[PDB]
Amino acid sequence: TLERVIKEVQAPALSTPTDEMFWSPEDPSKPNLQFLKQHFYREGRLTEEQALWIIHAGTQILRSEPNLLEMDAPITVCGDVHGQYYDLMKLFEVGGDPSETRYLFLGDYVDRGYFSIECVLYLWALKIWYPNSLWLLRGNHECRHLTDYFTFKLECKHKYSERIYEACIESFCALPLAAVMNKQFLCIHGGLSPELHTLEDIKSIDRFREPPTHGLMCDILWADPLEEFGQEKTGDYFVHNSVRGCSYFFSYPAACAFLEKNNLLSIIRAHEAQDAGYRMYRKTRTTGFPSVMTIFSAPNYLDVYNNKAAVLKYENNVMNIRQFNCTPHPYWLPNFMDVFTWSLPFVGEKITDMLIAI
Amino acid sequence: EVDRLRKRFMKLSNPLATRMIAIFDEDGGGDVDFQEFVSGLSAFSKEEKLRFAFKVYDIDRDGYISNGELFIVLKMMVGNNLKDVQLQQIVDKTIMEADKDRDGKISFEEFTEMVENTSMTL
Amino acid sequence: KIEWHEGVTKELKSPGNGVDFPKKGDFVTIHYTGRLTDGSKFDSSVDRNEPFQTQIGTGRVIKGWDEGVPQMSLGEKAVLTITPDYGYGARGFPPVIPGNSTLIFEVELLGINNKRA
Ligand SMILES: C=CC[C@@H]1/C=C(\C)C[C@H](C)C[C@H](OC)[C@H]2O[C@@](O)(C(=O)C(=O)N3CCCC[C@H]3C(=O)O[C@H](/C(C)=C/[C@@H]3CC[C@@H](O)[C@H](OC)C3)[C@H](C)[C@@H](O)CC1=O)[C@H](C)C[C@@H]2OC
Ligand SMILES: [Ca+2]
Ligand SMILES: [Ca+2]
Ligand SMILES: [Ca+2]
Ligand SMILES: [Fe+3]
Ligand SMILES: [Zn+2]
């Protein structure tokens, strides 16, 4: 289409990949990552068959993993992404190429952002290529309830089909719930639980299901630190989370009690948006180390927060935070609304008004 | 009925001014007579209503909504509320999702199949 | 628990000049962020990085805005709670706004007829 008004604006990729384009020339059993990276960047779509293959192959690997992953340093811990694919590209450029960098994502890959399925298909493709160096944890948004409530189900039905959405839902149930990194840090999305006493409690969870409205599996995905964390007037451990409407707020003595019980240094989490992309909570009295770490990897969250994003890098005995700003992305009308559905109600009004003038 | 409308026709800053006046002008002459006046109004007395909505975007009256036509008509109503980049991008993506035969344009069949979910009365 | 109003109530978050108020027929420039009662954003002019412009009190926008905005002064930050009847009603605005939805708009009046704050 040469005849467009704003020619300086690049058009989306028109066609779907062929088998020769899709499969990697180096490893014909795995997708071409470099191609996928560019194709998604130009808002290109895969065929239903190709997209289904990536998710199912991803499910195949995830189902073989335990509820509690166990990995050693070096590692790059990443927080929420929320369909911000063009910021996810910046993430890998800051953290390092997955082909030579060990990663750990804490969840929330979908909803809110209008490029959720691109994030999933690419992260799943990376998991296929690097099953023993890249790990994906489940976030509270990786379930049927929130994806249907928000935008992910709509995105799948719009860009692809219902079969794709059902594939992701099945895949989300295979996602690990937690991880113990380098025998020092408990890595989760949400926070602690009154039913979470030891790491053994996590291991006995049947994760192959939708998250419950309450309980251990719920809290791991939904729990938050208190707003006055580290400065609690009381000695209470938990309290109802009035903000989330479910799960609990956990406190500083609650965190310290867990860490001392399980011989862990800190709790690396996400789930909450930070202005700097991260927040370091009160250090423990036992080791002088930050009891809780919130990692958030979605810059300019919802295109309005104007916040930085960050990832945690832990190598040898060295740990540091790397921040990065947002990256421009193509525009979508709310809920993937087409310009016809978008303008017709207004057209009908202006025509009706013009009729009265006659 | 028509006699009353013929009497109203004898007696005779909207963003869609140039467009609607061009729709009534069915031969593209520049003027509008009674037969064009009645025919234009007769659509508002569900298929005919959608056919009129299609003519709003179809500027050259070729039966297809092009990428350029879609942008221009939308800009008449939107103005500066959307940037050129933002509007051009959602215009591009709308075309692709509606262009089922892949000709770069939007037919009337493709148009109706897009807004089957979705208005004009007298 | 039952309040009595036309369909829109304004919550002043930050005061304007307290002098210039949008009258019927005036053109206003507003940065808005629309959320549902659950607090989820469905649209924002900040997303487009472009302040929203329209003629107020002439039926261009929803009734909640035509009656809410004139209550604001130039430069004021306020929140408009809009009933479905002053909103999009039972039909709503698919696929963006569900039927019978109460709308919550964070509005900042930036300009009135090219007089800025
Ligand atoms: C060619 C494009 C059309 C043209 C679109 C633009 C200029 C772009 C502009 C940023 C709109 C946004 O587009 C990204 C988008 O903003 C929303 O998301 C939104 O937050 C909203 O509620 N707003 C926007 C801010 C002012 C109040 C309200 C509104 O009154 O909006 C008005 C509205 C929808 C009135 C309807 C008209 C039909 C009546 O039948 C109905 O009566 C019940 C009320 C809008 C501004 C119209 O005056 C003008 C248009 O429609 C809507 C949920 C849907 C809307 O897209 C349409
Ligand atoms: Ca004529
Ligand atoms: Ca045409
Ligand atoms: Ca076509
Ligand atoms: Fe989140
Ligand atoms: Zn979360």
Numbering used by the authors:
A (entry chain A): 9 to 366
B (entry chain B): 41 to 52, 73 to 105, 110 to 182, 187 to 190
C (entry chain C): -4 to 112
Provide passages from the article that reported this PDB entry:
The CN complex is composed of a catalytic (CnA) and regulatory (CnB) subunit that binds Ca2+, and is activated by Ca2+–CaM2. Here we report the crystal structures of fungal CN ternary complexes with FKBP12-FK506 from highly clinically relevant human fungal pathogens: A. fumigatus, C. albicans, C. neoformans, and Coccidioides immitis, reflecting the common invasive fungal pathogens, including a mold, yeasts, and a dimorphic endemic fungus. Each complex has three components: (1) the CnA subunit with catalytic domain and the BBH, (2) the CnB subunit, with four EF hands bound to Ca2+ and wrapping around the BBH, and (3) FKBP12 bound to FK506, interfacing with CnA/CnB.
Despite the similarity, significant differences were observed in FKBP12 near FK506 and the BBH/CnB interface. Comparison of fungal FKBP12s with hFKBP12 highlighted conformational differences at Lys48-Met50, Glu55, and His88 (Gln48-Gln50, Arg55, and Phe88 in A. fumigatus). In AfFKBP12, the aromatic side-chain of Phe88 is partially buried at the FK506, FKBP12, and BBH interface (SASA = 43.8 Å2, 34%), providing important hydrophobic contacts. The CnA Tyr363 forms a direct H-bond with AfFKBP12 Arg43, a key residue in stabilizing interactions with the acidic side-chain of Asp38, which directly contacts FK506 O4 and O5. Asn367 makes a H-bond with Pro90 in FKBP12, but this interaction is absent in the mammalian CN-complex due to the P90G substitution in FKBP12 and L186Q substitution in CnA.
